[PDB]
Enzyme design. Sequence first.
Site, PDB file in Angstrom:
ATOM      1  N   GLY B 150       0.810  -1.284  -0.023  1.00 47.43           N
ATOM      2  CA  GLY B 150      -0.047   0.019   0.065  1.00 47.43           C
ATOM      3  C   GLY B 150       1.094   1.089   0.014  1.00 47.43           C
ATOM      4  O   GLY B 150       0.370   2.299  -0.550  1.00 47.43           O
ATOM      5  N   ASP B 168      -6.873  -0.596   6.604  1.00 48.81           N
ATOM      6  CA  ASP B 168      -7.162  -1.713   7.182  1.00 48.81           C
ATOM      7  C   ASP B 168      -5.978  -2.642   7.419  1.00 48.81           C
ATOM      8  O   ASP B 168      -5.892  -3.548   6.661  1.00 48.81           O
ATOM      9  CB  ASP B 168      -8.304  -2.339   6.645  1.00 48.81           C
ATOM     10  CG  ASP B 168      -8.601  -3.783   7.351  1.00 48.81           C
ATOM     11  OD1 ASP B 168      -8.199  -4.006   8.762  1.00 48.81           O
ATOM     12  OD2 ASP B 168      -9.499  -4.536   7.174  1.00 48.81           O
TER      13      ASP B 168
HETATM   14  C1  LIG Z   1      -6.079  -9.161   7.783  1.00 47.32           C
HETATM   15  S1  LIG Z   1      -6.789  -7.171   7.393  1.00 47.32           S
HETATM   16  C2  LIG Z   1      -7.194  -7.108   9.056  1.00 47.32           C
HETATM   17  C3  LIG Z   1      -8.243  -7.716   9.723  1.00 47.32           C
HETATM   18  C4  LIG Z   1      -9.515  -7.155   9.592  1.00 47.32           C
HETATM   19  N1  LIG Z   1     -10.061  -6.985   8.377  1.00 47.32           N
HETATM   20  C5  LIG Z   1      -4.897  -6.573   7.686  1.00 47.32           C
HETATM   21  C6  LIG Z   1      -4.083  -6.935   6.404  1.00 47.32           C
HETATM   22  O1  LIG Z   1      -3.116  -5.720   6.446  1.00 47.32           O
HETATM   23  C7  LIG Z   1      -2.269  -6.215   5.341  1.00 47.32           C
HETATM   24  N2  LIG Z   1      -0.920  -5.477   4.985  1.00 47.32           N
HETATM   25  C8  LIG Z   1      -0.022  -5.267   6.020  1.00 47.32           C
HETATM   26  N3  LIG Z   1       0.998  -4.602   5.525  1.00 47.32           N
HETATM   27  C9  LIG Z   1       0.441  -4.189   4.337  1.00 47.32           C
HETATM   28  C10 LIG Z   1       0.903  -3.253   3.298  1.00 47.32           C
HETATM   29  N4  LIG Z   1       2.341  -2.632   3.569  1.00 47.32           N
HETATM   30  N5  LIG Z   1       0.466  -3.030   2.276  1.00 47.32           N
HETATM   31  C11 LIG Z   1      -1.001  -3.394   2.229  1.00 47.32           C
HETATM   32  N6  LIG Z   1      -1.547  -4.155   3.031  1.00 47.32           N
HETATM   33  C12 LIG Z   1      -0.687  -4.659   4.035  1.00 47.32           C
HETATM   34  C13 LIG Z   1      -1.994  -7.839   5.503  1.00 47.32           C
HETATM   35  O2  LIG Z   1      -1.452  -8.437   4.577  1.00 47.32           O
HETATM   36  C14 LIG Z   1      -3.459  -8.105   6.100  1.00 47.32           C
HETATM   37  O3  LIG Z   1      -4.085  -8.757   5.117  1.00 47.32           O
HETATM   38  N1  LIG Z   2      -3.879  -6.538  17.389  1.00 49.68           N
HETATM   39  C1  LIG Z   2      -4.762  -6.437  16.380  1.00 49.68           C
HETATM   40  C2  LIG Z   2      -5.034  -5.179  15.711  1.00 49.68           C
HETATM   41  C3  LIG Z   2      -5.796  -5.342  14.364  1.00 49.68           C
HETATM   42  C4  LIG Z   2      -7.198  -4.521  14.468  1.00 49.68           C
HETATM   43  C5  LIG Z   2      -7.860  -4.725  13.449  1.00 49.68           C
HETATM   44  C6  LIG Z   2      -7.406  -5.162  12.125  1.00 49.68           C
HETATM   45  C7  LIG Z   2      -6.256  -5.799  11.929  1.00 49.68           C
HETATM   46  C8  LIG Z   2      -5.327  -5.757  13.231  1.00 49.68           C
HETATM   47  F1  LIG Z   2      -4.043  -6.218  12.978  1.00 49.68           F
END
Ligand SMILES: C[S@@H](CCCN)C[C@H]1O[C@@H](n2cnc3c(N)ncnc32)[C@H](O)[C@@H]1O
Ligand SMILES: NCCc1ccccc1F
Lengths: 294, 294
Positions: B150, B168
């Site tokens: 991202g 997110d």
């Molecule tokens: C699983 S989602 C959170 C759970 C509630 N919807 C959080 C996501 O952030 C992404 N993530 C972490 N770092 C990045 C970056 N740098 N770019 C995009 N997405 C990212 C990671 O791969 C999870 O899938």
């Molecule tokens: N420790 C959990 C913090 C969190 C909250 C929500 C989504 C992703 C995430 F990582």
Amino acid sequence: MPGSELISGGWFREENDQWPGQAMSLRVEKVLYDAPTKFQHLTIFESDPKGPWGTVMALDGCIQVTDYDEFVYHEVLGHTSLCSHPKPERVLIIGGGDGGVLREVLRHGTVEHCDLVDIDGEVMEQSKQHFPQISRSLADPRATVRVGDGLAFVRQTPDNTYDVVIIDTTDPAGPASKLFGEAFYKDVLRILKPDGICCNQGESIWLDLELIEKMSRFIRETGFASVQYALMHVPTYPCGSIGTLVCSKKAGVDVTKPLRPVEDMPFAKDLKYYDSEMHKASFALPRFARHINN
Amino acid sequence: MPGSELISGGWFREENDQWPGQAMSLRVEKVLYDAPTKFQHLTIFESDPKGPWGTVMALDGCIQVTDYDEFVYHEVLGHTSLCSHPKPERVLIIGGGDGGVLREVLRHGTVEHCDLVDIDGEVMEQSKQHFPQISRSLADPRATVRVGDGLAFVRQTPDNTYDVVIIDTTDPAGPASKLFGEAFYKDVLRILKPDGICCNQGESIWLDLELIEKMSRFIRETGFASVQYALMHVPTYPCGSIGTLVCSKKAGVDVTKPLRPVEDMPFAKDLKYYDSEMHKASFALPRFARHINN
Ligand SMILES: C[S@@H](CCCN)C[C@H]1O[C@@H](n2cnc3c(N)ncnc32)[C@H](O)[C@@H]1O
Ligand SMILES: NCCc1ccccc1F
Ligand SMILES: C[S@@H](CCCN)C[C@H]1O[C@@H](n2cnc3c(N)ncnc32)[C@H](O)[C@@H]1O
Ligand SMILES: NCCc1ccccc1F
């Protein structure tokens, strides 16, 4: 039921069949006290100094207080109830032997006398030994602290004795069992004055929604004019919250907007959680649960 | 940092130096996935059918979603942001590879298109396999899902592209580290149209208060007119809650009271957590945290 076994390999694990399949776990630095009382298994330990939680108390395996977050529940029960009353002079606390709700009730200048009745005198003793910031209140001359069952105490109490009744009990498994029942609330209604307010330890909207529905309904049916559940953030109760049913004997009262705001009182700025915005916000419930409140 | 070793004894234990001394534990009925991806350790398991949690996902040992409570954070991020904007047509999700926020964004009839960019393609694949109710959104014609960081995506995106950007992400330890940083937010501000809104995964008032305050500071310094933190109840995030900083590019915007109430929209009755009462209540913070919002 659960006891000493919940400490294992440097952790306390809150396993319980009241919340099957999950367990909040806190690291144990030092156990301070671990024994059966006359009524309950009582465990007090110091948690890991690298975490923020401080000293921790559990009854029958269920976490009751930690130093870090105790102010939430104690401020919410004490101030949501007394700030909903026009002039609360006489208060009853059933349970609460740690002294926390009493500490908060005794911040109010209107209070002339509070009776506190907990079945387990060791809870008051060990709270004085290990939780002095929660228990200081117990010695106050406005309070009369008794060791006894709350059901029996209310059955000996006159009609129209109290302005506010606060039911700060353990979970239904154990000595608090009948305090979750309709017969008990019948007597709580009777011992309240006409303008009286009661609140309780009202359990979780995640784990106990059906019980909350059941109790909210029977408390109205016993004759309280209104009942509203206030939700609050407490990390160390199961699923990270708990609620209290705030009930009014008198019709026409909206407990969800404070009647006597704390902000008009000299101790408002010492509180760590509660204020009038938090009070109103606490009655906004997730859609899945909002029917409890209407 | 952590991996398969957090499953032991038939339980998954959420031990992490991001929350020292505590751990949420869930009973494991069946491991469904457990392995490094290109970027993160991904663990998926079916929890105790005797409990409510259902399937559970963790990244780098940190619980991300459960079937029982996923709707809270997904609804709050998707609706608090879009109901604060006057006509959100173009939306970007950074992270969110499970598809939950996208599910919620796509309920809004105003949305023409939502882009979603998650660094870990394996999260989308496994969410489609093991969380269909959450991922049911990923292949919608109104969504374009790309796998990438991202940080680079926002840098490459032109000015004034989006109405709403929803960040997110996972916790700061790991691939999301720079998405809690000032340079990222500078690009977020830049890619929002003049009446744009963003919100994020804003961490915990009990664990991260200093980080939250630092972010709110630097988001304002970068040029957002206003930043307000909304608190929500999520049992399976550390301490039982999480928040979101909801930030307006334009001055004069009060995101704490809904601009376009969801009750006027046909899907309001489908939501399990969010409504206008919850939206307003979410911005009432405990006194100890109140300086985040003023
Ligand atoms: C699983 S989602 C959170 C759970 C509630 N919807 C959080 C996501 O952030 C992404 N993530 C972490 N770092 C990045 C970056 N740098 N770019 C995009 N997405 C990212 C990671 O791969 C999870 O899938
Ligand atoms: N420790 C959990 C913090 C969190 C909250 C929500 C989504 C992703 C995430 F990582
Ligand atoms: C420790 S306090 C709760 C912790 C937050 N203040 C709950 C108290 O309820 C008491 N309790 C349980 N059953 C009863 C009965 N039947 N009567 C009075 N007090 C009771 C129990 O001994 C705890 O000290
Ligand atoms: N499982 C904890 C429920 C509870 C909440 C508050 C006080 C006592 C108490 F027992």
